[PDB]
């Protein structure tokens, strides 16, 4: 289930590790446009909220 664009659904992910490489390596995606950050460096970077 995916809510439509007029009611896009938002989730607050916090206080957990997340291997962005598993998303970064899957071929199921077409556009992976990252702004202000590099997808390769998303791994070592520790963000908040």
């Amino acid at each position: 289930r995916f809510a439509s664009v007029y009611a896009w659904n938002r989730k607050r992910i916090s206080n957990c590790v997340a291997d962005y490489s598993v998303l970064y390596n899957s071929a199921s995606f077409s556009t992976f446009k990252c702004y202000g950050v590099s997808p390769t460096k998303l791994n070592d970077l520790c963000f908040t909220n």
Binding site: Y24, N25, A27, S30, F32, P39, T40
Partner: protein
């Protein structure tokens, strides 16, 4: 002049560029960030698709 020729998918020609990523740009063909040249790509779904 050095001409490197290969065949890839339709949504993968964008990967043939400096800085791009994906399976093609990580394990098969890497382009240097200071690359000087051209990247010609054309659809051939009448000669390599059976």
């Amino acid at each position: 002049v050095y001409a490197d020729s290969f065949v890839i998918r339709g949504d993968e020609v964008r990967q043939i560029a400096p800085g791009q990523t994906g399976k093609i740009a990580d394990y098969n063909y890497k382009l240097p960030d200071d690359f000087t040249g051209c990247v010609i790509a054309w659809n051939s779904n009448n000669l390599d698709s059976k």
